[PDB]
Curated annotation (Swiss-Prot):
Residues 550-688 are annotated as: Domain 4, binding to the receptor. Changing D637A: Loss of toxicity due to decrease in cell binding. This is Protective antigen. Residues 1-233 are annotated as: Domain 1, calcium-binding. Proteolytic activation by FURIN cleaves the protein in two parts, PA-20 and PA-63; the latter is the mature protein. The cleavage occurs at the cell surface and probably in the serum of infected animals as well; both native and cleaved PA are able to bind to the cell receptor. The release of PA-20 from the remaining receptor-bound PA-63 exposes the binding site for EF and LF, and promotes oligomerization and internalization of the protein. The gene is pagA. Changing W201A: No effect on LF-binding ability and as toxic as the wild-type. It comes from Bacillus anthracis. One of its GO terms (molecular function) is metal ion binding. Protective antigen constitutes one of the three proteins composing the anthrax toxin; it mediates attachment to host cells and translocation of edema factor (EF) and lethal factor (LF) into the host cytoplasm. PA associated with LF forms the lethal toxin (LeTx) and causes death when injected; PA associated with EF forms the edema toxin (EdTx) and produces edema. PA induces immunity to infection with anthrax. Gene3D superfamilies: 2.60.40.810, 3.10.20.110, Protective antigen, heptamerisation domain (2.60.120.240), Toxin - Anthrax Protective Antigen,domain 1 (3.90.182.10). Ca(2+) 1 binds at D152, D154, D156, I158, E163. The record marks R153, L162, F211, F418 as: Alpha-clamp. Changing K634A: Slight decrease in toxicity. Pfam families: Binary_toxB, Binary_toxB_2, Binary_toxB_3, PA14, PA_Ig-like.
Length: 688
């Protein structure tokens, strides 16, 4: 579909002003004026052109080449002129470079009709077939058979002047035209204005060329935003733990293994973290919160019959999560499961080059439609038990938290092959040779607008002290947000999925903050939000952008929100009864709540707390219709609230994750006393 020659069509006579760069499958190198809808009519006159690629014969014959305009043409085969009308021997299974230049002054028609022909020795002449033509090796190295060599200093195939001045791509029939940006035309039409470095084959320093990206000659799994030359395409992987089971480790000394199941099974919630002011760290990490809610009230050790000399082990179901912009194919990264500050309990590895599927951007391994991975799998004799000694086990009970630290070892890359127009995993290309340079030459933005989860993107930006990086276009904060995260601006206001930019805060590392502060001073600007178009990003900046509605822990996970926000989010009550409340609660708000406390307040002001335990707050559930039910009966012994006097109040309180207590207090109290909570419903019995 893409094979044939690469063509440069210029409006000037001397190969200086390229109007169109496109490829054509066969020897027909024509561009009809019907396809130049995005080129001003005056510039549809092509006075010169250059095509470039390779030819391969499927039968070794003596061939004679000819074109539509031999008098305006010079053609070379392997640096030999064949046109400037003679015969030349060509061998099967060998590849020959092709260059063709064309010049015609003051053409009277628009576009170009031009065909490349050959005649074999049986004297039969034909437009050269698609199967005989290949594109140039627009790579940074030649291949064994295909060498590399109209100003194109980085050899990506986009001429220096287009990369510097701005270009657009438009999708024709089965072809993609690359052309200069022209304001009056392409702005109305809504097209994206691309700039890129004429000296960087990949301007973002990733494994896909600026040309591959914008022409779709690229791994279909690469994220849509990373098809922009200025957005880095690379994987970003963390592990998601979905649940966990603890149990006592069998023991040499106890011979009987007939005893009752004494395990502890808990759901877990895992979030990708970022530890700050933004951090400079490129590590992958996630934190796991083990559910503290009711599963009587024995200690873990009492539950499992653990004496102080015993050991326990854990199993858990997990998935890998790719929140980056490029797929992984044949190596999942290695992960440490860590307890407390640095007690590694386990090393989690998958089997290299034996992945059951690719791990795509915005996706999981295994895919959610398949079973998760179990840390100790059932069909796996050699799975290492994840063990804790007794003190570690109590530490786990008290913290109810684990950390998964995942390396950046991501294996080989699927790259485009100009010889055959296919994408295939390349054993000679590895993510480890790419990531260091991506990290060195881009600004990193971490943004949580999607669903309060941290999503990192990197955007090519100038390093003022490194002359090469100096050849990239200026990247503004505003542009960065648009191309990397899909911010748009329907009314002079930058927003993300309907939320104004000013609904998110800005945080930077120390160096970046001082940089941005200087820039605002030079702009005589006091408010970043009103000059995003003028704030310039540099390589190595780190920027953290977070929904302002919420409170964040040191990991930058949303763990709360203002009383006013939580209250307002609950104001709309569909239905209330002695059995519970039915509300409409923003999915973002539900994420920051550990549960609810229900209480009846009598006439003298005394309070009966219905679900009065730190592990009994889990009384909300999300209904099949998106509405939340708060269930009064759950810890009321399956009975609706009994209100002995209509003037009594039913109060319901929301408890946020940062106010959630996860253990009995020091003195031993398992009640809700002292828990910081937020009143969100209060009505008399007669109002219910
Ligand atoms: Ca180039
Ligand atoms: Ca380039």
């Amino acid at each position: 579909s893409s094979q044939g020659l690469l063509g440069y069509y210029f409006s000037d006579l001397n190969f200086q002003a390229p109007m169109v760069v496109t490829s054509s499958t066969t020897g027909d190198l024509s561009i009809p004026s019907s396809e130049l809808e995005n080129i001003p009519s005056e510039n549809q006159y092509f006075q010169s052109a250059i095509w470039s690629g390779f030819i391969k014969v499927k039968k070794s014959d003596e061939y004679t080449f000819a074109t539509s305009a031999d008098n305006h043409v010079t053609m070379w085969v392997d640096d030999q002129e064949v046109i400037n009308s003679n015969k030349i021997r060509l061998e099967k299974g060998r590849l020959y470079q092709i260059k063709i230049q064309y010049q015609r002054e003051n053409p009277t028609e628009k576009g170009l009709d031009f065909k490349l022909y050959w005649t074999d020795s049986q004297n039969k002449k034909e437009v050269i077939s698609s199967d005989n033509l290949q594109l140039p090796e627009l790579k940074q190295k030649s291949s064994n058979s295909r060498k590399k060599r109209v100003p194109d200093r980085d050899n990506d195939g986009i001429p220096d002047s287009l990369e510097v001045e701005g270009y657009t791509v438009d999708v024709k029939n089965k072809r993609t035209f690359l052309s200069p940006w022209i304001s009056n035309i392409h702005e109305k039409k809504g097209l994206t204005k691309y700039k890129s470095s004429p000296e960087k084959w990949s301007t973002a320093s990733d494994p896909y060329s600026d040309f591959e990206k914008v022409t779709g000659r690229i791994d279909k799994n690469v994220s849509p935003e990373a098809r922009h030359p200025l957005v880095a395409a690379y994987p970003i992987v963390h592990v998601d733990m979905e649940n966990i089971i603890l149990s006592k480790n069998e023991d040499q000394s106890t011979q009987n293994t007939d005893s009752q199941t004494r395990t502890i099974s808990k759901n877990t919630s895992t979030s990708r973290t970022h530890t700050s002011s933004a951090g400079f760290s490129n590590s992958n990490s996630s934190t796991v919160a083990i559910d503290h809610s009711l599963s009587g009230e024995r200690t873990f050790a009492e539950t499992m019959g653990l004496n102080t000399a015993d050991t326990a082990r854990l199993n858990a179901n997990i998935r890998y999560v790719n929140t980056g912009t490029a797929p992984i194919y044949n190596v999942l990264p290695t992960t440490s499961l860590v307890l407390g500050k640095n007690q590694t309990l386990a090393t989690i590895k998958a089997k290299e080059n034996q992945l059951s599927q690719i791990l795509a951007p915005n996706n999981y391994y295994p895919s959610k439609n398949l079973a998760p991975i179990a840390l100790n799998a059932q069909d796996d004799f050699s799975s290492t038990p994840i063990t804790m000694n007794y003190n570690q086990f109590l530490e786990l009970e008290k913290t109810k938290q684990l950390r998964l630290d995942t390396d950046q070892v991501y294996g080989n890359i699927a790259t485009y092959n100009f010889e055959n127009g296919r994408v295939r995993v390349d054993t000679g290309s590895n993510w480890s040779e790419v990531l260091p340079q991506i990290q060195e030459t881009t600004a990193r933005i971490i943004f949580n607008g999607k669903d309060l989860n941290l999503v990192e993107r990197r955007i090519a930006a100038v390093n003022p002290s490194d002359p090469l990086e100096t050849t990239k276009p200026d990247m503004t904060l505003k542009e960065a947000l648009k191309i990397a995260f899909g911010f748009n601006e329907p009314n002079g206001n930058l927003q993300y999925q309907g939320k104004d930019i000013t609904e998110f805060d800005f945080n930077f590392d120390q160096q970046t903050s001082q940089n941005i502060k200087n820039q605002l001073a030079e702009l005589n600007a006091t408010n970043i939000y009103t000059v995003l178009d003028k704030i310039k990003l540099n390589a190595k900046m780190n920027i953290l952008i977070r929904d302002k509605r919420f409170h964040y822990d040191r990991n930058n996970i949303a763990v709360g929100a203002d009383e006013s926000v939580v209250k307002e989010a609950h104001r709309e009550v569909i239905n209330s009864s002695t059995e519970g409340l039915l509300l409409n609660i923003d999915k973002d708000i539900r994420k920051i709540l550990s549960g609810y406390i229900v209480e009846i307040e009598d006439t003298e002001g005394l309070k009966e707390v219905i679900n009065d335990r730190y592990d009994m707050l889990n009384i909300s559930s999300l209904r099949q219709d998106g509405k939340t039910f708060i269930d009064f009966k759950k810890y009321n012994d399956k009975l609706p609230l009994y209100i002995s006097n209509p003037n009594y109040k039913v109060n319901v309180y929301a408890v946020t994750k940062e106010n959630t207590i996860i253990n009995p207090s020091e003195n031993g109290d398992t009640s809700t006393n002292g828990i910081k909570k937020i009143l969100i419903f209060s009505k008399k019995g007669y109002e219910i």
